[PDB]
Amino acid sequence: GPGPEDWLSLLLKLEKNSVPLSDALLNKLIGRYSQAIEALPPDKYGQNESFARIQVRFAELKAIQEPDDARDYFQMARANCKKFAFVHISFAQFELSQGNVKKSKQLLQKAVERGAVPLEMLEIALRNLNLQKKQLLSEEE
């Protein structure tokens, strides 16, 4: 069975081929991400960055499709991929978008306390939250 890097490569190609986006194409994409998650045991991949990207994208797609039921998918991604700062920032971004500023800050502070990496990404996110910006992270690379 293919690993997370092979699955992510297929999933990103499907996202590129799902333009212009529609409800039907969004449902198809979410379905394909669920198939990757069903095929990838989290106990083998907790330290895998491509696996963290798969779990985060599923949660982000669910936040578009049904924001009132997306929290559990961010909690799953954080439970499985806690090492990566971008996982915690994605959850904090979701909370911020829902108007839960206090929860967004607590998620970022807990990630700093628990040593999610890289630290710099978390400091930028905390600065942007304190500056009252809508996005914790801009078009960053």
Q: Identify the burial level of 25 via C-beta atoms within 10 angstroms of its C-beta, where 0-12 means exposed, 13-18 middle and 19 or more buried.
A: middle
From residue 29, alpha-carbon distances to 2, 43, 77 in Å are 18, 24, 18
In angstroms, the CA 116 to CA 134 distance is 22
Q: What's 55's domain CATH number? A: 1.25.40.10
Method for structure elucidation: X-ray
Q: How far apart are CA 136 and CA 128, in angstroms?
A: 5
Q: What is the resolution of this structure in A?
A: 2.2
- What is the number of other CB atoms lying within 10 angstroms of the CB of residue 5? 13
Residue-number span of the structural domain to which 22 is assigned: 1-141
Beta strands in 28-129 (DSSP E): none
Burial (0-12, 13-18, 19+ Cβ within 10 Å), 17:
exposed
Burial per residue of 86-104, b for 16 or more beta-carbon CB atoms within 10 angstroms, e otherwise = bbbbbbbbbbbeeeeeebb
C-alpha 47, offset from chain centre:
15
Residues in the chain, overall count: 141
User: What is the count of structural domains for the chain?
Assistant: 1
Whether omega for the bond prior to residue 41 falls within 30 degrees of 0, making it cis, is no
